[PDB]
Amino acid sequence: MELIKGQALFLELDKKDFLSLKNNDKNIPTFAHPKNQEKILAIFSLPYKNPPQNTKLIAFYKDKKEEIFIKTLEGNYKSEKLQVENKKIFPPKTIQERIAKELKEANAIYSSYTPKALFNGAFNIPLNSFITSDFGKARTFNEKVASYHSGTDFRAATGTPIYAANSGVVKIAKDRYFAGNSVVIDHGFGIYSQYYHLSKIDVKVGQKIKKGELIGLSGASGRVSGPALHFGILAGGKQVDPLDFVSKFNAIFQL
Ligand SMILES: CC(=O)N[C@@H](CCN(CC(=O)O)Cc1ccccc1)C(=O)N[C@H](C)C(=O)NO
Ligand SMILES: [Zn+2]
Numbered sequence: 149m150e151l152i153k154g155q156a157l158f159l160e161l162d163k164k165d166f167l168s169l170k171n172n173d174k175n176i177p178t179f180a181h182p183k184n185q186e187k188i189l190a191i192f193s194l195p196y197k198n199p200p201q202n203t204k205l206i207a208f209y210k211d212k213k214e215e216i217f218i219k220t221l222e223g224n225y226k227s228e229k230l231q232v233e234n235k236k237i238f239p240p241k242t243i244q245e246r247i248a249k250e251l252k253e254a255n256a257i258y259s260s261y262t263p264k265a266l267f268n269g270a271f272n273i274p275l276n277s278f279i280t281s282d283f284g285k286a287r288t289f290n291e292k293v294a295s296y297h298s299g300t301d302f303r304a305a306t307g308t309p310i311y312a313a314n315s316g317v318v319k320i321a322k323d324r325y326f327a328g329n330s331v332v333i334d335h336g337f338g339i340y341s342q343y344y345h346l347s348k349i350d351v352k353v354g355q356k357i358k359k360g361e362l363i364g365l366s367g368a369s370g371r372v373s374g375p376a377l378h379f380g381i382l383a384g385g386k387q388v389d390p391l392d393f394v395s396k397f398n399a400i401f402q403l
Pocket of ligand 1: 295
């Protein structure tokens, strides 16, 4: 199989006698195929930055093992050359501390795996607008990726209502350094949606939210370039191309 860096893949496996799916010594969770009772599904994602060139997963059954080989593709992302090397930068200590704290917090949240669906059918876009800055635009130095856009931005004037892309539970609902005012929803199965730069947060941590329910108003908080909604999906432990992910997910779960 082949998969573009920065994307998720829904792997389909026989259910009967299945024991475990492994990537070296890391276990990858599974969940039911909603249509085919003889199958299960796993999400496998490649990171945008520094992905392996190749991956081998093994599905262990009671009677045998199944190898699955996935070749990393570079895809056709937009990229621009950096003029100055992305060397160590020197933020104020107060900012270093905040960043480190929020990273620890988020790493913890993304680690607390929910082994059931909290979604309700297909994902919907969070507002009926258009993309102004796509996922995966990159900046390179010496042809190596230095940084990339980890979500997709939708055009929005400040104060535009934003709606949950699917049902779930709110895990994050505060102001953060990279993200500004942000909401993160757990949808189950290690799938999280992210809504950044809000001017107003309308939910709280722990709240059950329905698909299409208001979560906030769009803004420019924490944004250098002007008001817009930054939308992200984390799945399989990695930030992945959100519209690509929704397309894949909806192909399986929309009915
Ligand atoms: C670390 C950092 O400074 N993040 C900034 C800016 C740009 N990101 C970096 C990234 O991966 O988080 C690179 C970048 C962006 C665009 C093109 C090339 C590189 C930020 O506001 N991110 C939010 C999520 C966003 O993206 N809003 O729109
Ligand atoms: Zn963005």
